[PDB]
């Protein structure tokens, strides 16, 4: 597999971790991944999506405002087994860039006094374990799991300016996916 380049295509889950309440909804996007093999085991990966659209909201409220991010992972891969296996299990280590934008409250946040809101960029550790199950020497199938650390602060003004409050996305996210293979 060595020298090898291999794209997946594919559902990516995004489950942030409990951010009255503030909670962020559950999102699904096209998650594509780019992948190189350094070595038969050791492969860069590149995880890229289509916009990852969430809610915010109270129990009390409902949801009040919505966020977008674009969440690129870079990382350091094991494949375990060898190139002939058609079974390859994996882990991988990296960091993890998230960007948000196009953030707003709703009518109703606004109703409740709420408006101007954005979040800072993010940084940070994010690990992988995950399957690829070779059928031909061109196609794999693919299922995976990852965890980033994506903390953030929200900025707004409710009433006036209490616009600091650190939100931590920690979301944990699931990958079924099928690939292509450029040799
Ligand atoms: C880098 C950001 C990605 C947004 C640009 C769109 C990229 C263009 O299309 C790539 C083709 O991917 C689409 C295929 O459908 C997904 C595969 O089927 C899933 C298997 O369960
Ligand atoms: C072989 C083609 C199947 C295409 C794969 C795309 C996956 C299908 O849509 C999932 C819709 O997104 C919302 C579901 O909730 C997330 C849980 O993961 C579901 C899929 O196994
Ligand atoms: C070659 C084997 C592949 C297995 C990878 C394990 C390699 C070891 O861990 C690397 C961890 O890299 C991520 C670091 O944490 C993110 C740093 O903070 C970012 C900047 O603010
Ligand atoms: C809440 C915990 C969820 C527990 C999930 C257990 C998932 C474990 O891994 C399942 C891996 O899938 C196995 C593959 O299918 C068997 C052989 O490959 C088929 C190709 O013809
Ligand atoms: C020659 C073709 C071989 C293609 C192999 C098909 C293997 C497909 O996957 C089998 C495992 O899927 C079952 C599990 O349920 C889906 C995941 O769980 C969803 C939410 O966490
Ligand atoms: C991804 C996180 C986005 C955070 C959005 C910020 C929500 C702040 C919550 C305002 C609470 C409103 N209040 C007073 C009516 O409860």
Sequence with gaps: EAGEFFMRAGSA???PTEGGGFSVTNNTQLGLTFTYMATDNIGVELLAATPFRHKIGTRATGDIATVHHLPPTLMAQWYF????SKFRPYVGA???YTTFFDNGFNDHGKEAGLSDLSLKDSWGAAGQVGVDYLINRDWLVNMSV???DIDTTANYKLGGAQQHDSVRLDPWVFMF?????FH
């Design 13 to 15: 889950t995004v489950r």
């Design 81 to 84: 087994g060898d190139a002939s």
């Design 94 to 96: 990296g960091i993890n």
């Design 146 to 148: 990852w965890y980033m």
């Design 177 to 181: 996916s099928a690939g292509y293979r």
